[PDB]
Amino acid sequence: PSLLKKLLLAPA
Amino acid sequence: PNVPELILQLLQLEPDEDQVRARILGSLQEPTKSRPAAFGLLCRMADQTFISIVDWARRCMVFKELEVADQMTLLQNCWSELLVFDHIYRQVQHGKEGSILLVTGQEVELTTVATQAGSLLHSLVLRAQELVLQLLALQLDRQEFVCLKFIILFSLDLKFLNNHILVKDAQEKANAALLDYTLCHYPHSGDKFQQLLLCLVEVRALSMQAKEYLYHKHLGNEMPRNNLLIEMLQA
């Protein structure tokens, strides 16, 4: 659905 | 002369250019699907630049203490401006007007851009280099660069944000830090704070032109699928 979100809520 | 506390923290949150260059150079060795192979490598390089920019925004003081809906909205508003500014400051550190420096460390000569790039890219590069020259003349240092970056990250009309008073604080707090710093350290050739803000206006105009260049490549169907930047271009 989103990409930014994925990047944002990532490891550490 | 003293330095505002917000700048000193932003300095320590800055990743050193060597570990970002290695991470990006290392991710460019990873294999991928073929179909120009350098155009594909440059898109991925720019992409990885934007990833480490997100990683920088994640660690910053006010951005971290923000919920995800607001975090996304900020980045969606300033992503290309943060990419342009990163390129510009790289050129400021690279004091060579005959070529442009890439995040991977490879130099590309302007003559190469002028005969191998289309008008849009070549215009875009020359315009960016003009701004590089103005920032060198204004004696842009690293304290202001870090401050400028933090101003770009939050420079958004407060209507579009939910955690609104937190953001308002950031904007004022970053403007006062940049004001306080340029007044104590650069009191000689006019209003440095104002000139630097006038640069922000040019970085915004460059970032739109950059967005138009991506849209041009996108209509040409030359842009690789999954590309992070054209997905940013569409939200």
Author numbering:
A (entry chain B): 141 to 152
B (entry chain A): 221 to 255, 259 to 458
Quote what the paper states about this structure.
One of the 48-member nuclear receptor superfamily in humans is steroidogenic factor-1 (SF-1, NR5A1), which plays an essential role in development and adult function of steroidogenic tissue. SF-1 is required for proper regulation of gene expression and is essential for sexual determination and development of the adrenals, gonads, and hypothalamus in mammals. Despite the wide variety of phospholipid species that interact with SF-1, these lipids all share a common 1:1 stoichiometry, interacting within the same ligand-binding pocket at the C-terminal ligand binding domain (LBD) of SF-1, as shown by several X-ray crystal structures of the human and mouse orthologs of SF-1 (20).
To that end, we determined the 2.5 Å crystal structure of the same human SF-1 ligand binding domain construct complexed with the same 14-mer peptide (representing the PGC1α co-activator motif, EEPSLLKKLLLAPA) and dioleoyl PIP3(18:1/18:1). Thus, all protein sequences were matched between the dioleoyl structure presented here and our previously published structure bound to dipalmitoyl PIP3 (21). As expected, the crystal structure of SF-1 bound to dioleoyl PIP3(18:1/18:1) adopts a 12-helical bundle structure typical for nuclear receptor ligand binding domains, distributed into three layers, with fully ordered helices 1 and 2 typical for the subclass of nuclear receptors which SF-1 belongs (NR5A). Comparing our matched dioleoyl versus dipalmitoyl structures confirms the acyl chains in both structures follow similar paths, with the sn1 acyl chain crossing over and on top of the sn2 chain and the PIP3 headgroups similarly positioned. Indeed, the PIP3 headgroup is in a similar position in the dipalmitoyl and dioleoyl-bound structures, and density for the last two omega carbons of the dioleoyl acyl chains was poorly defined, suggesting the last two carbons on both acyl chains are disordered in these crystals. In comparing the two PIP3-bound structures, the overall RMSD of SF-1 bound to dioleoyl versus dipalmitoyl PIP3 is 0.319 Å over 189 C-alpha atoms, suggesting grossly similar conformations. The 2–3 loop was well-ordered in the dipalmitoyl-bound structure, but dioleoyl PIP3 induced disorder in the 2–3 loop when compared with the well-matched dipalmitoyl PIP3-bound structure. Here, we observe that helix 11 has a clear shift away from helix 12 in the dioleoyl-bound structure of SF-1, although helix 10 at the N-terminus of helix 11 is almost indistinguishable between the two structures.
